[PDB]
């Protein structure tokens, strides 16, 4: 395996659906319920996902983990508003770099430091918008989006409590989701149990950003079990901060564009691969947690 592709430069990206994942003759593959065996490039895979009717084996999971592919299972959500529980196998047999976890702990235990990191990570989604601009959908630098992110930055600057951060989080999510709804001329309500394509494309992108976030956190050894943003509504771990840094910049306009153009789910999978690969969103997230950890 020589120099296994640095996790940040790993490129392949899947969520496998209705197929038992196995190993044939050396390589990890998935076999659907019609006889079709499609190989998984495990040396370049960032994450795999497992939808309903999927079943992975032991040595397949070993060849993913020893190569360093984070594996989750998509189902598990059972509430009415929340993506409840996603079960995620961390490759801990690869012994991780340590001092980045020490830096994350020294900022997590100090309450004023966690609040300071909470501040910068809330404006990180604001600069994500500014950097990652799509060719379609809205323009980021219009008057409405700039006015709402300016109100968001002004409110998160004067914030002093995590419940104020949760409230401002809610107004930010309502503001973006509805402005995208206006642009794409639809009525939008975020329900994970909805048959509308703007919603299950958003849940598919939730799973995609979840996988990207655990690969970014595992690449620096950071656990999901240190959530710097916490609350009654916001209880998922650190994945529900490093995953929704890139909703309103990457996934949500891509989900709305995919639900507007309206072909199948596979074009959305491939579009998530294309945008996470072209702009190097994984390496961007890793480098942002890098400049977080040593400051």
Partner 1 sequence: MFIRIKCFSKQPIAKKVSREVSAYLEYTGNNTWEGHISGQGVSNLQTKLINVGKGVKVVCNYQDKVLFAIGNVAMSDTGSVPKYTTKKVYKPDDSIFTLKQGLVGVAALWHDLGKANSYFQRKLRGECNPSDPVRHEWVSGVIVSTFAKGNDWLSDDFIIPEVKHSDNVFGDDQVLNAVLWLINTHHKKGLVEDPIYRATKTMFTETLQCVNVNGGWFNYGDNIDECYKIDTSFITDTYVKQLNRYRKKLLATKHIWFTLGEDQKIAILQECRVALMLGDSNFSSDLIGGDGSHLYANLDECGNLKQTLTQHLLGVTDCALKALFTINHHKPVKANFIPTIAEKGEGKFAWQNGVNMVDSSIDNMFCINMASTGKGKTLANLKLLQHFGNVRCSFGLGMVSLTKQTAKQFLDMGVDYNSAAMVTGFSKSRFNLGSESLDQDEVSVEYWGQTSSLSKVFPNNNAGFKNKKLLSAPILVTTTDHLVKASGVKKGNKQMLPYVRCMHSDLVLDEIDDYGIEDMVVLARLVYLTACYGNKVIISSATITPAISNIFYEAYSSGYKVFCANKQTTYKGVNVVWWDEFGIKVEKVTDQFSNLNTRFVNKRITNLLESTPKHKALVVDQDDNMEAVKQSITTLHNAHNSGGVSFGLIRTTTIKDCVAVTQELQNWETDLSIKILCYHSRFVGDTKAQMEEYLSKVLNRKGDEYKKFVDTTTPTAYIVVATPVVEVGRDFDFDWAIIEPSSERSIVQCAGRVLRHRSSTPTTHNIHILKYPFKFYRNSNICYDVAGYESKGYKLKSKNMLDIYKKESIVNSVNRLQGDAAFYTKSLTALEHKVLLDKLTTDIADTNVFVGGWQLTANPHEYCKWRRGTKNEDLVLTDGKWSGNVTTTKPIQSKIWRKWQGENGSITVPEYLLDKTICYNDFYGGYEN
Partner DNA sequence: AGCAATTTAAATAGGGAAGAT
Partner DNA sequence: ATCTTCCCTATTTAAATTGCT
Interacting residues toward DNA by CB under 7 A? 18-20, 22-26, 31-33, 52-55, 57-60, 75-76, 266
Torsion, Cα 157 158 163 167, to 10 degrees, reads -70
- Assess 246 for contact with its own copies (CB under 8 A): no
- Assess 66 for contact with partner 1 (CB under 8 A): no
* Tokens encoding 128: 């994500």
What residue 174 binds from its own copies, DNA, partner 1, none (CB within 5 to 8 A, per partner kind)?
none
CA distance 206 to 211: 9
What residue 2 binds from its own copies, partner 1, DNA, none (CB within 5 to 8 A, per partner kind)?
partner 1
- Assess 96 for contact with its own copies (CB under 8 A): yes
CA distance 11 to 114: 32
- Give the CB-side neighbour count of residue 192, counting CA atoms within 13 A: 17
Q: Which stretch binds partner 1 (CB under 8 A): 70-78, 87-95, 193-201, 203-211?
A: 193-201
Size of the site for partner 1 (CB under 8 A): 50
- Assess 58 for contact with partner 1 (CB under 8 A): no
Contacts of 257 (CB under 8 A, 6+ apart): 134, 136, 137, 271
- Assess 98 for contact with partner 1 (CB under 8 A): no
What residue 182 binds from DNA, its own copies, partner 1, none (CB within 5 to 8 A, per partner kind)?
none
Least distance from its own copies to the Cβ atom of residue 179, Å: 30
Query: Where does residue 237 fall: left (phi above 0), alpha (psi -120 to 50 degrees), or beta otherwise?
Result: left
What b/e string do you get for 161-180 counting C-beta neighbours within 10 Å, with b at 16 or more? ebeebeebbeebeebbbebb
Rounded to the nearest 5 degrees, what angle is found at the Cα of 121, between the Cα atoms of 116 and 124? 135
Q: Considering only residues 121-140, where is the footprint of its own copies by CB under 8 A?
A: none
CA distance 122 to 138: 21
Nearer to its own copies, 37 or 87 (CB): 87
Q: Which stretch binds partner 1 (CB under 8 A): 6-14, 82-90, 216-224, 286-294?
A: 6-14
Nearer to its own copies, 91 or 253 (CB): 91
Query: Is 203 in contact with 79 (CB distance < 8 Å)?
Result: no
How distant is the alpha carbon of residue 228 from its chain centre? 16
Binding footprint of its own copies on the chain (CB under 8 A)? 20, 22, 50-59, 61-63, 65-66, 71-78, 81-99, 101-102, 105-106, 109, 214, 218, 221, 223-227, 232-237, 239
Binding footprint of partner 1 on the chain (CB under 8 A)? 1-6, 9-12, 16-20, 24-29, 31-44, 67, 195-197, 259-264, 266-267, 270, 273, 277
């Amino acid at each position: 395996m020589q120099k296994q592709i640095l996790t940040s430069q790993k490129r392949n990206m899947y969520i496998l659906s209705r197929c038992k994942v196995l190993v044939k003759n050396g390589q990890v593959c998935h076999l659907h319920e019609d006889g079709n065996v499609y190989t998984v490039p495990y040396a370049n895979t960032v994450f795999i996902g497992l939808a309903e009717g999927t079943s992975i084996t032991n040595e397949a999971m070993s060849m993913l983990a020893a190569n360093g592919v984070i594996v989750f299972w998509t189902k598990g959500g059972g509430y009415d508003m929340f993506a409840a529980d996603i079960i995620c196998h961390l490759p801990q047999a690869d012994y991780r770099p340590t001092k980045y976890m020490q830096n994350w702990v020294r900022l997590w235990l100090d309450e004023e430091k966690k609040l300071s990191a909470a501040k910068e990570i809330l404006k990180m989604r604001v600069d994500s918008l500014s950097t990652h601009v799509h060719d379609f959908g809205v323009d980021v630098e219009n008057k409405r989006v700039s006015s709402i992110v300016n109100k968001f930055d002004k409110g998160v600057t004067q914030a002093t409590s995590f419940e104020s951060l949760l409230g401002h989080e809610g107004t930010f999510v309502k503001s973006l989701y509805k402005e995208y709804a206006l642009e794409y001329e639809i009525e939008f309500k975020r329900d994970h149990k909805s048959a509308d394509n703007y919603n299950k494309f958003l849940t598919l992108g939730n799973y995609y950003a979840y996988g990207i976030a655990r690969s970014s956190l595992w690449a620096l050894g950071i656990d999901n079990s240190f959530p710097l943003l916490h609350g009654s509504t916001r209880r998922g771990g650190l994945v529900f901060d490093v995953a929704d840094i890139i909703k309103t910049s990457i996934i949500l306009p891509l989900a709305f564009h995919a639900a507007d153009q309206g072909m199948s789910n596979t074009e959305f999978k491939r579009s998530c691969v294309a945008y996470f690969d072209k702009n190097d969103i994984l390496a961007y997230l890793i480098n942002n947690i890098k400049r977080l950890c040593m400051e």
